[PDB]
Design a protein around this ligand. Sequence first.
Ligand SMILES: *[C@@H]1O[C@H](CO)[C@@H](O)[C@H](O)[C@H]1O[C@H]1C[C@](C)(N)[C@H](O)[C@H](C)O1
Ligand SMILES: *[C@@H]1O[C@H](CO)[C@@H](O)[C@H](O)[C@H]1O[C@H]1C[C@](C)(N)[C@H](O)[C@H](C)O1
Ligand code: AAC
Ligand code: CL
Ligand code: CL
Ligand code: CL
Lengths: 7, 7
Amino acid sequence: XXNXXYX
Amino acid sequence: XXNXXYX
Ligand SMILES: *[C@@H]1O[C@H](CO)[C@@H](O)[C@H](O)[C@H]1O[C@H]1C[C@](C)(N)[C@H](O)[C@H](C)O1
Ligand SMILES: *[C@@H]1O[C@H](CO)[C@@H](O)[C@H](O)[C@H]1O[C@H]1C[C@](C)(N)[C@H](O)[C@H](C)O1
Ligand SMILES: CC(=O)NCC(=O)O
Ligand SMILES: [Cl-]
Ligand SMILES: [Cl-]
Ligand SMILES: [Cl-]
């Protein structure tokens, strides 16, 4: 993970 | 990708 969003 | 570094 480590990324973010939101999709 | 998804991992990091830095090499
Ligand atoms: C991770 O490194 C790349 C280069 O490969 C940069 O362009 C990017 O800004 C950097 O990402 C940030 C944001 C993220 C992905 N949510 C994490 O918090 C990382 C550690 O820092
Ligand atoms: C997402 O990350 C930011 C930066 O650290 C925090 O400010 C925010 O609280 C965080 O969102 C929470 C709530 C969410 C979106 N429902 C998920 O549980 C994420 C993983 O954590
Ligand atoms: C070295 C590099 O590009 N790291 C970023 C990733 O792991 O996604
Ligand atoms: Cl992070
Ligand atoms: Cl999402
Ligand atoms: Cl690197």
